[PDB]
């Protein structure tokens, strides 16, 4: 993996979902599923659970 | 005495024709004695060279060599008591006199430092000679060899080849330092080697000054401190530091507290203090005029072209100056124009309403001449007054246009038709409306910009283009253009200038102004709907700063939509931040001020300081600049009112933070749309000087006038040496006095002694050892005629005219042949107006002074009532003259206006004449020339001529005969200025002068020291020494590209890996550091050479930075008289007047190193100290740092073991560096997310593409030579501009602004022209040679006529390749021309005659056929020579529509013609060939009359294809396959992938492949290279060898998925 911060929001540290090739937090995870299911940071699908 | 018998017989072959060589030889032959033979037998060699400069010019040689006061007393002239100078030749006539000096040097270095002394010693003689009433014309002679005519050039070298031995023997057989400068003067032509060993063979005396230096400048440096003692010292220092100064609250950094910044920014930006209104269109004054024009026109003709045709014939008839003045030559064709208007009312029943009120005449108006609206009743009175003055004005000047004249006209009877004054009263009564009013000096209704739909905002910028175009060609109006009627609350506007601009098919606008030229004006803007007038306002702005938006509505409406589509993640956020940003982008261009440039640049530092984790403490008291007006608030509420909107809301506004950073960074850089121009240059040099002196007198080191040669007095010495030991005080353990320049002397000792041993990451092993035209004055830099040249070309013109009418005896001067000379050597009535009007106003105001003093001097050349006391001289005129001296410099602000009318208007007397006499015999220009301004309406210049008329400016000596410093002036070739024995601080000849100038950067103006000519040759030595030492270093990146590329490649991977990476700066790195620091560093280095392991001597460098310790910074002359009139620099002047009151014109100093002199000698100093400080954190905070350097900005990347607990790491890091006068600027910002280096910002995981520096750099810098060269620069800036991925849609709208700047410019269009439209992928694959094929085959849209030339190219190129010869004799087949070479190739490849019949019928009309376009050999040779050997833009585009729409084409015969004349000779050919593409490709039979230009396009197609197959591919040939959605924001990296069918290393082979092509052009000036090098030399538009010796130079292209996958593909 890369650097230990969220790839989206830059200012979080803890409880991070190991996504495809970049971290992601539970705060900004809710604000991606309502647009679509394809991401908008790496453009490959993600796990839901 | 072994050559003494040879010497008298050697020089007997020079005949004493005159009395100047008879007296020399009889005291030469009568002295066989070597003691005067090298004084009296040696002063003859000057006396033969001095006579050459009196036979060429008009002259009488000086045989007595005597004074000037009694050379004016040989004529009967009262004594002026001049200073004592001696001329080497004069010539007097009447009351003018021609001093001519004579001096000769060989090397240039001590030539210009003789010319600058001679010209100053001559021009400090006029001011005492002016008071006697005679003016001078001074000349000098530059000679770089001996080229005498009176001998035959084969015996004078025998002098200096046989007198060079006689003085060595003469002083060996029988005064100290006056010997070898004579040798360096007498010798042969010096192909002299210049290096660091040149300093070694000097004398090196002492001064009893450098000992009190060395008591202060090398003492503490012992330079061999043991490396086991520094560690225990620094542990005590940190143990002092943390317990002492950090915990009691004096640390310099902090933790950013990320809410307190967005409490601070509101009071930073939202100026709730002042009283501006919220509505944006109200406060500004030009946004209002856009809003008033654009809602009066949106919610809502053969006689016209006849009138404009005779108008454009009047424009050609004006520029000849034939009617002996500039008044009745304008009323004359005013009469012509009003007669041609009144000969329209007798035509159709209605025409002056239905076809003229919709066009060129509004109510009570008429348009004519240069640009003047003349408005009929006033015009009617003037003609009646002129015919009242003269009974029959139009009987001879009616047709003086035949004889002594062009005698080609079309005005049938309007020349002679007397305008019936009893007829124009009806027309003057019919159209009557309110007159134009032009202003100087409550509630709102402006419809709330956010409440407009997304179509009626484009109709702001399409009024902004059309108002900006009428602003720009209000520069083109002719710069003399004096009106016919002259002369502040509100002015009703009688007559004034005018420009026009179309909006729709009935209504137009106008633009009214009074002052022509490039300064600020007082404009007014009108509409004309259907005849009705409606005033819509007034504003006050400046013309040439509006060149940014001239045609670029689609550009600046495509990027305010590109930048918005980055925010498709909060849709409600986008639909609000869209219609607030476009108000900002209007608000910048509609008010270009430096301040709302500087402020928007100041937010790329606020923005790193909020993504990072540590910001410097003082920066919020630096991002504020006070609103000097009430217009820089409405911009500073849409910028800050945007950062409050999307940096931080009170909720969790951190959804997608990366695009937020990108879109705020390209709003911080939205700064750059404003033109860097320095709005006025006398208020720029006050700021430049005030930034120069304030870090200097605060510390106390500036002095007044030094000697400029060697010595300093004692009181001047004391301030220098006290500044020296005050610079080095700064004891190590006091936290006060930390913002003070200088070094801690005990810390620098460790810093150099640890460097001696090999423990720093760099170490001094130092491979390949280092020891291997007009030029202006230095007090006014940045200008274009410095004050020395403005008299030198005067004296050249007077000497050229004084000889021309004494060869025959004309004694009359022609008022164009006296303007023919100056206007020639600065840069037949047609040739004058060809090259008069291609100046700038900065030069027109100089050309007037040159014409002025030349005609006054010519009037004085043959020359051999004051009771107008309306206003008494008693207290006015005499005082003004004395205070202002000469009449020429007299001010006009001393009196009222009407007194200039009444004192001029004395009756006719002996002062005047009549019949202004266009031949004008000499001796009358003091009375003829005044009447020409007595009849033209001007008065003031007539007042100056009337005043300058009426007398209103008023044996021991033989031991001294050896060359001593009293015996300097005996010779011209003595070379008095020669370097002979350097001293502790000087060089016995000069003292390293400079001069001041600014650089015009974006935010803050950078100063720049222009240096003299000795100073460059003494600076390049030191600079290449440091380039040699820093070549063997490992961490700088200033000159080497490779290490900079390694630093960027490290920074990418080390941001992504959890580092803590900083981004520093150094505040005033220029004017703080000093050469004495570089001395104290260069004393104790070792630098052991790898060839010979020893300690080299650096004494030739240690004894030349002492020269840079004592520089002489001038003051500019443009600031010494504006501070004299009336601000701590002003106090520095006005306390140095209460000393001895001489002006402070020189500042010897201690601490400057101006930015751009000693540049690489701080590139190492910014590296040694950085490695010391980067060792200070490997040892006291157990990490492993690494610190790069670009001499002004740094980045010290830091790894951490195993998140900002370690402020102690960083706040200590500043605290040592301030001990070495490397300060950390408050612009610095350190954290772990954003980091910068030379403005290339590296955000996490990516790079920010930074869209708005490239488009803002390509909208400007349109430099015009030819309309093919201008489609090279902007094509290249489009090639770089896709490497950061702007779009293609922004790329294809720069490439119609660049096309319509041409299609407006007279040139018309041509199939190459500007670069193409609809470009998608080919920026990745291929240079400019590829895109033209996609442009040409875009015309043939059916693709059925270039298919055959592609098939013939498939026949040819497979045959011309290797393994076969197949006509390698094509070197002569190309040179037949262009039109028939394809007629060879096609029947070579083989077809009928009918194929050539259906191919050669296509022809494109060219303009650079025989010669190329002229406006005042291919480009191949000038392209190769640069591999062989080594003003405001909006006034440099007007010269591309003023000297191009006039005569600029050339034919094969001797001659020139117009462009409209060529396009008038082409017919209409509707039969399907002209109907392919209109106005671009023609038929063959439509080119009958003009038939000598037309090449085919198809030959150019074939030559481009055989160029491209050489350069790449074997796939340019195929027919285009028709192309193949992903998200709009998925951009990714591609590589070029080119297949090149040559072999590389072409650095020399292009030179060896012109012998087979053209031998004499090479005389005077591989496997497949040769067959497509003769396909390049026959035209210009091809460009191979510029693209094969270089490479593609980006190779890392990054593009969108939606604009890299959507494209075509062309496989094989
Ligand atoms: Zn997040
Ligand atoms: Zn993703």
Numbering used by the authors:
A (entry chain B): 34 to 82
B (entry chain A): 2 to 175, 180 to 305, 321 to 461, 468 to 513, 520 to 804, 820 to 874, 886 to 922, 950 to 1039, ...
Please give me the paper's original passages concerning this structure:
The arenavirus genome comprises two ambisense RNA segments encoding four viral proteins: immature glycoprotein precursor polyprotein, nucleoprotein (N), large RNA-dependent RNA polymerase (RdRp) (L), and zinc-binding matrix protein (Z). The L protein is a multi-domain, multi-functional protein responsible for transcription and replication of the viral genome. The Z protein is a small but multifunctional protein containing fewer than 100 residues.
In the monomeric and dimeric MACV L–Z complexes, the stoichiometries of the Z and L proteins were 1:1 and 2:2, respectively. In the MACV L–Z complex, only residues 34–82 of the Z protein are visible, which make up the zinc-binding RING domain. The two zinc fingers, located on opposite sides of RING domain, use conserved C39/C42/C58/C61 and C52/H55/C72/C75 residues to coordinate the two zinc atoms, respectively. In the structure of the MACV L–Z complex, monomeric Z protein serves as a staple, interacting with L at the intersection of the core lobe of the PA-C-like region, the palm domain of the RdRp, and the thumb ring of the PB2-N-like region. Loop 1 of the Z protein contacts the L protein core lobe and the palm domain, while loop 2 interacts with the core lobe and the thumb ring. Residues LPhe642, LAla643, and LPhe689 of the core lobe and LPhe1378, LVal1388, and LMet1389 of the palm domain form a hydrophobic pocket at the interface between the two domains. The side chains of zTrp43 and zPhe44 are inserted into this hydrophobic pocket, just like one end of the staple. From the proposed model, the Z protein in the MACV L–Z complex is proximal to the putative product RNA exit surrounded by the structural elements of core lobe, palm domain and thumb ring, about 37.4 Å from the RdRp catalytic triad that is located in the central cavity. Considering domain rearrangement is needed for sNSV RNA polymerases to perform and coordinate complex catalytic reactions, the Z protein might exert the inhibitory function by locking the multiple domains of L in a catalytically inactive state.
